[PDB]
């Protein structure tokens, strides 16, 4: 069973932010336009018995003072009440400013992603679903006491905490254009959550981490945080060859109980960032290559969204990821028309109204040797036994 998180209230909240507007509606409506919803099990967002239960859940990671501030920000924006100088200073102390400003539903909006991803984790734990998709989740930058990169609450960290707290190891794979710093930091000292981010890094590029400083964890979590920074311009094939052996080696050595994949769509060639040149093509899209490989491991998996600022092309990609997941999990052939079906947001898919995006297409060897060494160090530190040459052969 492949699950997907949605709901009427969830849709309105996921569409209430100024930065991401109606992206989630385009995504879910295109999935619906392609007749995928009857193939999927709807997973409703988690709700709580009381304010105290909600607060307990969110402060499993975030600080009480930060959650207090995020609630107050919504309350202030809920009225005409412009912030006092003291309130501005309070918000600044949590980076609830500039790129992460307040809006009338900022706490409800960020809490909704947490509700969705926690529900997804529970459905995996109870084995109701083999894979769960949450295209309203994936906010990998939020820190314990700091908003960052349009992320206010870290739904990923809270979902992973629910998985490991259910011997359990989690592999987190972050495919976003940006380094998954918030998730990496949360599990820096934890050997049982191994994090792996592939991303662009360059001077002045957000958030700045995930590159040479390589730090890789600390304490009992030493060697447990993996990173592969790539230069601008990389295409589907080169990105696939860069991460492919790393993914397979992580699965062999870690033997994870769960995999959590952040599938931010800002690596697409048509994203306004214009840094990587990945596609959604399925003849092959780097995203689909990676997701297909992860799903072949037959490990219960959470697939999350993230970045993606070209909303129709994000919808194009995530619709294909959803169909691929159905096909790989259920063994059911999926046939998506190359033409965008008529539906509410059909006019947004100009100019050609095709499902393919409108695009025409040894430093990594050193990184591979470095990561192989780090994997061996992780395995030694943690008394894990693994076929050294079967893993080296992957590269
Ligand atoms: C969780 C994924 C979506 C939101 C975060 C993310 O992964 N995004 O896609 C980037 C895009 C971008 O340009 N930023 C950014 C740049 C500079 C500054 Cl200062 C703050 C934010 C992000 O956070
Ligand atoms: C020092 C600090 C730390 O975390 N450790 C450690 C202990 C046990 C294991 Cl298994 C791994 C690391 C030290 O020895
Ligand atoms: K990433
Ligand atoms: K870790
Ligand atoms: Zn991003």
Numbering used by the authors: 2 to 167, 177 to 223, 233 to 302, 316 to 393, 402 to 435
What do the authors say?
Indeed, several studies have demonstrated the role of HDACs in the life cycle of Schistosoma; class I HDACs (smHDAC1, 3, and 8) were found to be expressed in all stages of Schistosoma lifecycle, with smHDAC8 showing the highest abundance. We showed that mice infected with schistosomula knocked down for smHDAC8 transcripts showed a decreased number of recovered adult worms and lower egg burden, suggesting that this enzyme is a valid therapeutic target. Therefore, small-molecule smHDAC8 inhibitors represented a promising approach for the treatment of schistosomiasis. SmHDACs, and in particular smHDAC8, warrant attention as they are validated targets and are of potentially high therapeutic value in the search of new small molecules for the treatment of schistosomiasis.
J1036, bearing an n-pentylhydroxamate group and an N-(4-chlorophenyl) substituent, showed the highest inhibitory potency against smHDAC8 among all tested compounds. To get molecular insight into the mode of action of the newly identified inhibitors bearing n-alkyl substituted hydroxamate moiety, the crystallographic structure of the complex between smHDAC8 and J1036 compound at 1.55 Å was determined and refined. The electron density for the inhibitor was not perfect but its binding at the catalytic zinc could be unambiguously assessed. We observed only part of the inhibitor structure in monomer B. Here, the hydroxamate is interacting with the zinc ion and the long alky chain is located in the foot pocket, indicating that the compound is partially hydrolyzed under the X-ray conditions. This is confirmed by the observed binding of the cleaved capping group of J1036 in a noncatalytic smHDAC8 pocket. Analysis of the crystal structure of the smHDAC8/J1036 complex in monomer A shows that the inhibitor binds in the smHDAC8 active-site pocket, where it forms specific interactions with the enzyme. The internal hydroxamate group is coordinating smHDAC8 catalytic zinc ion in a bidentate fashion. The n-pentyl-hydroxamate group additionally interacts via hydrogen bonding with three residues, namely His141, His142 and Tyr341. The J1036 n-pentyl moiety is deeply buried in the smHDAC8 foot-pocket, underneath the catalytic zinc ion, where it makes non-polar contacts with smHDAC8 residues Phe21, Trp140 and Cys152. Finally, the halogen-substituted phenyl capping group of J1036 forms parallel-displaced π–π stacking with Phe216.
